[PDB]
């Protein structure tokens, strides 16, 4: 009967796909909870265990600019958007796993990228080949779930607990932006010719990946002011990956060189063009309600072009 309410505007907003989880930290695991209750019911955790379940998952984000504790729970809010306007599309396994998933997604990021770990050698490149940051987070989220009294799951069977675990395990793999060119070349073939079926295990898989790759790039679909600083934090992790390969004694894509910040207006245009644009017209033709992500989106695109014309 302990029913979390949230202030009049952020009750309201929160429904919407741009909401902004704004800068009180303290209030962010509450958030987190009412998203949790709305979206599987009041009933699905036991809140005691999912409390302290969401402080050791804070406890373990980095305080890097980008991939820190605000992104795992902005990443969340977009999946709960996604869940509340698809009502009928998944099932109570999907809603649980897909919260906590989006809520783990990037657990213990040092700020580098797959590639950087892999030139400088670290020892999770030697680990995990393919997707090694990714595996990592998985791992991490395994490792929380097994502390005593952090078990959310322990009501569910051996086989749902496993079911559950799966689709944690793959949605978080799906958050390795290497993965989603293919993934969503393979969408968009079976949309068109009208070889997509949802009751098929595996392209409920494929969907699910695309709603990670979408939820984790919500920052381009917020209002312009957000998408805006946003892009500063972004770049200020690039950046010190850059400074990182340069140490190396490797010259760093244009992305990530600081010495090129005059370029950021156009490799932005290029990312919408390449990687944003396409996914969110993906989602939307597969689950028409994300329309309003697509918008932001292109919305977002056509401030980037001002910005270039001054
Ligand atoms: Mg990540
Ligand atoms: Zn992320």
């Known amino acids: 009967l302990m029913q979390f309410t949230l202030p009049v505007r952020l009750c309201k907003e929160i429904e919407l796909f741009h909401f902004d989880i704004g800068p009180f930290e303290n209030m962010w695991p509450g958030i987190f909870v009412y998203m949790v209750h709305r979206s599987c019911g009041t009933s699905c955790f036991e809140l005691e265990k999912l409390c ?175 998408t805006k600083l946003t892009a500063n934090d972004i770049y200020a992790e690039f950046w010190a990956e850059g400074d990182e390969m340069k140490k190396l004694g490797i010259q760093p894509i244009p992305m990530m060189d600081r010495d090129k910040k005059d370029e950021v207006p156009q490799g932005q245009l290029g990312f919408y063009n390449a990687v944003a644009i396409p996914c969110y017209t993906t989602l939307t033709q597969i689950l028409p309600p994300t329309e309003p992500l697509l918008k932001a989106c292109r919305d977002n695109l056509s401030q980037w072009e001002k910005v270039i014309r001054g």
């Not at 070889?195 to 312009?224: F, P």
């Open 52 to 226: 302290r379940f969401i402080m050791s998952v804070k406890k373990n984000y980095r305080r890097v600019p980008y991939h820190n504790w605000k992104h795992a729970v902005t990443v969340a809010h977009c999946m709960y958007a996604i869940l509340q306007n698809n009502h009928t599309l998944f099932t109570d396994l999907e809603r649980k796993g897909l919260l906590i998933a989006c809520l783990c997604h990037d657990l213990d990021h040092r700020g580098f990228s797959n590639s950087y770990l892999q030139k400088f050698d670290h020892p999770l490149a030697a680990l995990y080949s393919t997707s090694t940051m990714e595996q990592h987070h998985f791992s991490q989220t395994v490792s929380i779930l097994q502390l005593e009294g952090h078990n959310i799951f322990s009501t569910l069977s051996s086989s749902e607990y496993e079911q559950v675990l799966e689709i944690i395990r793959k949605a978080i793999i799906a958050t390795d932006l290497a993965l989603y060119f293919g993934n969503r070349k393979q969408l968009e073939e079976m949309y068109q010719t009208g070889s997509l079926n949802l009751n098929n295990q595996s392209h409920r898989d494929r969907v699910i990946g695309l709603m990670m790759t979408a939820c984790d790039l919500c920052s381009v679909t917020k209002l312009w002011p957000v």
